[PDB]
Scaffold this motif. Sequence first.
Motif, PDB file in Angstrom:
ATOM      1  N   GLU A 260       3.384   3.492  22.724  1.00 16.76           N
ATOM      2  CA  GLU A 260       4.452   4.350  23.177  1.00 16.76           C
ATOM      3  C   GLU A 260       5.753   3.615  23.362  1.00 16.76           C
ATOM      4  OE1 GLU A 260       1.976   6.400  26.614  1.00 16.76           O
ATOM      5  OE2 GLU A 260       3.334   7.849  25.570  1.00 16.76           O
ATOM      6  N   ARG A 261       6.830   4.374  23.497  1.00 18.26           N
ATOM      7  CA  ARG A 261       8.140   3.798  23.697  1.00 18.26           C
ATOM      8  C   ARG A 261       8.461   3.763  25.181  1.00 18.26           C
ATOM      9  NH1 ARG A 261      13.733   3.993  20.595  1.00 18.26           N
ATOM     10  NH2 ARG A 261      12.362   2.996  19.022  1.00 18.26           N
ATOM     11  N   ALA A 262       9.076   2.675  25.617  1.00 18.67           N
ATOM     12  CA  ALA A 262       9.393   2.563  27.030  1.00 18.67           C
ATOM     13  C   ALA A 262      10.873   2.482  27.186  1.00 18.67           C
ATOM     14  CB  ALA A 262       8.714   1.324  27.633  1.00 18.67           C
ATOM     15  N   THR A 263      11.401   3.277  28.093  1.00 11.84           N
ATOM     16  CA  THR A 263      12.812   3.150  28.280  1.00 11.84           C
ATOM     17  C   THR A 263      13.097   3.001  29.793  1.00 11.84           C
ATOM     18  OG1 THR A 263      13.703   5.428  28.347  1.00 11.84           O
ATOM     19  CG2 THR A 263      12.931   4.751  26.199  1.00 11.84           C
ATOM     20  N   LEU A 264      13.699   1.866  30.135  1.00 15.40           N
ATOM     21  CA  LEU A 264      13.997   1.555  31.520  1.00 15.40           C
ATOM     22  C   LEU A 264      15.497   1.534  31.764  1.00 15.40           C
ATOM     23  CD1 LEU A 264      11.750  -1.519  32.236  1.00 15.40           C
ATOM     24  CD2 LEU A 264      11.364   0.204  30.482  1.00 15.40           C
ATOM     25  N   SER A 265      15.884   2.121  32.888  1.00 15.88           N
ATOM     26  CA  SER A 265      17.301   2.212  33.261  1.00 15.88           C
ATOM     27  C   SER A 265      17.689   1.244  34.333  1.00 15.88           C
ATOM     28  CB  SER A 265      17.612   3.623  33.762  1.00 15.88           C
ATOM     29  OG  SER A 265      17.270   4.546  32.766  1.00 15.88           O
ATOM     30  N   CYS A 266      18.937   0.864  34.315  1.00 13.26           N
ATOM     31  CA  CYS A 266      19.475  -0.063  35.278  1.00 13.26           C
ATOM     32  C   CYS A 266      20.907   0.436  35.434  1.00 13.26           C
ATOM     33  CB  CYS A 266      19.481  -1.461  34.687  1.00 13.26           C
ATOM     34  SG  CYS A 266      20.457  -2.715  35.563  1.00 13.26           S
ATOM     35  N   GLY A 267      21.153   1.089  36.567  1.00 14.33           N
ATOM     36  CA  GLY A 267      22.450   1.648  36.851  1.00 14.33           C
ATOM     37  C   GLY A 267      23.128   0.660  37.756  1.00 14.33           C
ATOM     38  N   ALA A 268      24.443   0.561  37.623  1.00 17.68           N
ATOM     39  CA  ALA A 268      25.177  -0.320  38.487  1.00 17.68           C
ATOM     40  C   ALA A 268      26.138   0.580  39.327  1.00 17.68           C
ATOM     41  CB  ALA A 268      25.921  -1.368  37.698  1.00 17.68           C
ATOM     42  N   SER A 269      26.468   0.059  40.505  1.00 20.74           N
ATOM     43  CA  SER A 269      27.276   0.762  41.461  1.00 20.74           C
ATOM     44  C   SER A 269      28.788   0.601  41.263  1.00 20.74           C
ATOM     45  CB  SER A 269      26.811   0.329  42.881  1.00 20.74           C
ATOM     46  OG  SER A 269      26.992  -1.053  43.172  1.00 20.74           O
ATOM     47  N   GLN A 270      29.171  -0.147  40.231  1.00 19.15           N
ATOM     48  CA  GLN A 270      30.581  -0.436  39.863  1.00 19.15           C
ATOM     49  C   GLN A 270      30.330  -0.864  38.484  1.00 19.15           C
ATOM     50  OE1 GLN A 270      32.399  -3.552  41.772  1.00 19.15           O
ATOM     51  NE2 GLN A 270      31.411  -3.181  43.772  1.00 19.15           N
ATOM     52  N   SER A 271      31.346  -0.921  37.650  1.00 13.65           N
ATOM     53  CA  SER A 271      30.997  -1.241  36.313  1.00 13.65           C
ATOM     54  C   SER A 271      30.933  -2.702  36.120  1.00 13.65           C
ATOM     55  CB  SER A 271      31.967  -0.642  35.340  1.00 13.65           C
ATOM     56  OG  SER A 271      33.206  -1.238  35.565  1.00 13.65           O
ATOM     57  N   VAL A 272      30.064  -3.072  35.191  1.00 13.46           N
ATOM     58  CA  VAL A 272      29.811  -4.443  34.813  1.00 13.46           C
ATOM     59  C   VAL A 272      30.655  -4.766  33.616  1.00 13.46           C
ATOM     60  CG1 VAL A 272      28.046  -6.079  33.981  1.00 13.46           C
ATOM     61  CG2 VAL A 272      27.449  -4.106  35.577  1.00 13.46           C
ATOM     62  N   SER A 273      31.582  -5.671  33.844  1.00 18.69           N
ATOM     63  CA  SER A 273      32.517  -6.116  32.843  1.00 18.69           C
ATOM     64  C   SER A 273      32.024  -6.782  31.546  1.00 18.69           C
ATOM     65  CB  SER A 273      33.525  -7.001  33.536  1.00 18.69           C
ATOM     66  OG  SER A 273      33.074  -8.309  33.585  1.00 18.69           O
ATOM     67  N   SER A 274      32.607  -6.381  30.413  1.00 16.27           N
ATOM     68  CA  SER A 274      32.288  -6.987  29.133  1.00 16.27           C
ATOM     69  C   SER A 274      30.795  -6.836  28.821  1.00 16.27           C
ATOM     70  CB  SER A 274      32.672  -8.504  29.157  1.00 16.27           C
ATOM     71  OG  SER A 274      34.096  -8.743  29.246  1.00 16.27           O
ATOM     72  N   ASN A 275      30.155  -5.852  29.433  1.00 13.72           N
ATOM     73  CA  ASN A 275      28.724  -5.729  29.194  1.00 13.72           C
ATOM     74  C   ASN A 275      27.934  -7.084  29.415  1.00 13.72           C
ATOM     75  OD1 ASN A 275      29.234  -2.843  28.671  1.00 13.72           O
ATOM     76  ND2 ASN A 275      27.885  -2.920  26.798  1.00 13.72           N
ATOM     77  N   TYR A 276      28.315  -7.766  30.498  1.00 17.07           N
ATOM     78  CA  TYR A 276      27.684  -8.997  30.990  1.00 17.07           C
ATOM     79  C   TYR A 276      26.393  -8.667  31.798  1.00 17.07           C
ATOM     80  CZ  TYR A 276      30.990 -12.478  29.394  1.00 17.07           C
ATOM     81  OH  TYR A 276      31.493 -13.386  28.486  1.00 17.07           O
ATOM     82  N   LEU A 277      25.377  -8.234  31.063  1.00 15.46           N
ATOM     83  CA  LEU A 277      24.120  -7.837  31.648  1.00 15.46           C
ATOM     84  C   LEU A 277      22.925  -8.385  30.895  1.00 15.46           C
ATOM     85  CD1 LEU A 277      23.393  -5.185  33.707  1.00 15.46           C
ATOM     86  CD2 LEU A 277      21.820  -5.232  31.725  1.00 15.46           C
ATOM     87  N   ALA A 278      21.975  -8.980  31.636  1.00 12.84           N
ATOM     88  CA  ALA A 278      20.736  -9.535  31.054  1.00 12.84           C
ATOM     89  C   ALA A 278      19.406  -8.805  31.492  1.00 12.84           C
ATOM     90  CB  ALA A 278      20.659 -10.986  31.396  1.00 12.84           C
ATOM     91  N   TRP A 279      18.355  -8.907  30.677  1.00 10.86           N
ATOM     92  CA  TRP A 279      17.072  -8.335  31.079  1.00 10.86           C
ATOM     93  C   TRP A 279      16.050  -9.471  31.060  1.00 10.86           C
ATOM     94  CZ3 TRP A 279      16.182  -3.414  32.707  1.00 10.86           C
ATOM     95  CH2 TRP A 279      17.161  -2.461  32.473  1.00 10.86           C
ATOM     96  N   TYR A 280      15.097  -9.468  31.979  1.00  5.63           N
ATOM     97  CA  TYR A 280      14.032 -10.474  32.013  1.00  5.63           C
ATOM     98  C   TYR A 280      12.753  -9.765  32.216  1.00  5.63           C
ATOM     99  CZ  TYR A 280      17.919 -13.510  33.510  1.00  5.63           C
ATOM    100  OH  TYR A 280      19.127 -14.061  33.597  1.00  5.63           O
ATOM    101  N   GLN A 281      11.686 -10.470  31.880  1.00  6.80           N
ATOM    102  CA  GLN A 281      10.367  -9.988  32.085  1.00  6.80           C
ATOM    103  C   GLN A 281       9.826 -10.942  33.114  1.00  6.80           C
ATOM    104  OE1 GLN A 281       6.906 -10.944  29.444  1.00  6.80           O
ATOM    105  NE2 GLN A 281       7.049  -8.772  28.863  1.00  6.80           N
ATOM    106  N   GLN A 282       8.871 -10.509  33.934  1.00  9.01           N
ATOM    107  CA  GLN A 282       8.217 -11.447  34.907  1.00  9.01           C
ATOM    108  C   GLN A 282       6.754 -11.065  35.028  1.00  9.01           C
ATOM    109  OE1 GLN A 282       9.277 -11.719  39.202  1.00  9.01           O
ATOM    110  NE2 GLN A 282       8.998 -13.889  38.740  1.00  9.01           N
TER     111      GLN A 282
END
Lengths: 216, 215
Positions: B17-39
């Motif tokens: 199946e396909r998984a789609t996870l959201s991560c909303g920010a409370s102010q915008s994150v500049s230049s799309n400076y966002l990372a994802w990690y697995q743990q």
Amino acid sequence: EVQLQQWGAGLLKPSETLSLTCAVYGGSFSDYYWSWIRQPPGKGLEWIGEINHSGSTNYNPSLKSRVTISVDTSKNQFSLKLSSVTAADTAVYYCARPPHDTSGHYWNYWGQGTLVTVSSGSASAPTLFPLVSCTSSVAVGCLAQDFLPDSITFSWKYKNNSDISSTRGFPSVLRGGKYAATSQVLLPSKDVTDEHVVCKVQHPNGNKEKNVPLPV
Amino acid sequence: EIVLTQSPATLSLSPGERATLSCGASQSVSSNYLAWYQQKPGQAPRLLIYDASSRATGIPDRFSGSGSGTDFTLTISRLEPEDFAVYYCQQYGSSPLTFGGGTKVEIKRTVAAPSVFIFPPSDEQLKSGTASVVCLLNNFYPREAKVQWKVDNALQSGNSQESVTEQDSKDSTYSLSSTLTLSKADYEKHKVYACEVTHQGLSSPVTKSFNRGEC
């Protein structure tokens, strides 16, 4: 391509100061901003601060009052000091490095982590108690209590000294500043002759064992 | 500080199946400076995506990132078994660097109601001054399960703690242990001890009790 090895006291009492160190092997130690990040058992990650080889630091204001991160270019290491600790600071602390010296501060290299626990108690080996019950498989358990730090491992042996493989593993729970953990083996009902089984645990402060009476 | 909010808290899917996870920010994150990690249990976070949509070296393209401003997404297009883990998003657009609270991607299997066992505190521990009454629930699915302690039918609250295992690697089930803790004193002042368990694989709540001294 790069290794960060950490170390430092894993157990402390309230008001003391946490001291950890991280050593880098591989690549250059220059210009990157080296970070410390932590993670409370069961929670998410919090970034603490960073420092580059010139000594320039950036701190999360959530800790600024109490944090001091410093560097040592002669050993290619950096270190973290967190004063006036409380139970809230119990956590796995990590050091980390970004991929490029002048890019985003996200991290592709990580230390292995150091669990640091802040408790009012003193280190103790666990004291063990048998869990006798009262589906064609009977459950037998062992309870480990009053132990610190949280570093235990269980194992099970038959009266015949052959291993019991049928192990089930639960996370410790915290209380009174010390930990408890349980363990169980599921023995097929129709195994009624052994009068018991033996529970074993290892802990830094000493290993223990206790026979657990088979029921019915 | 920018608060990252991730949803859902748990995503229960099957391999394929396909998984789609959201991560909303409370102010915008500049230049799309966002990372994802697995743990994974006990491991350090592992980098998967950086700059919102670029895969870290060696990350297979089943993984893709996207989003911008205050809204970001991580997509795993066809989960493989090793993809079930926890995931965090992390913004590095402003100081301080912050992480979201994570979302667990868990294996969805058929309902499995738990086998239940209760255990009286040992006579030996009773002498030391405390009684630890334990209840185990083994091999159940899904993870939600209510464990309730009754002492002389008095619903007991605030004197128990639970601990739950990881999803079993082979059969996808959970086991959970609950511990009711009383002074030897109180333990002495009562007689019927009960562990009421409710789980959706169960048509009616199960109950395992015992009478003090009778075990």
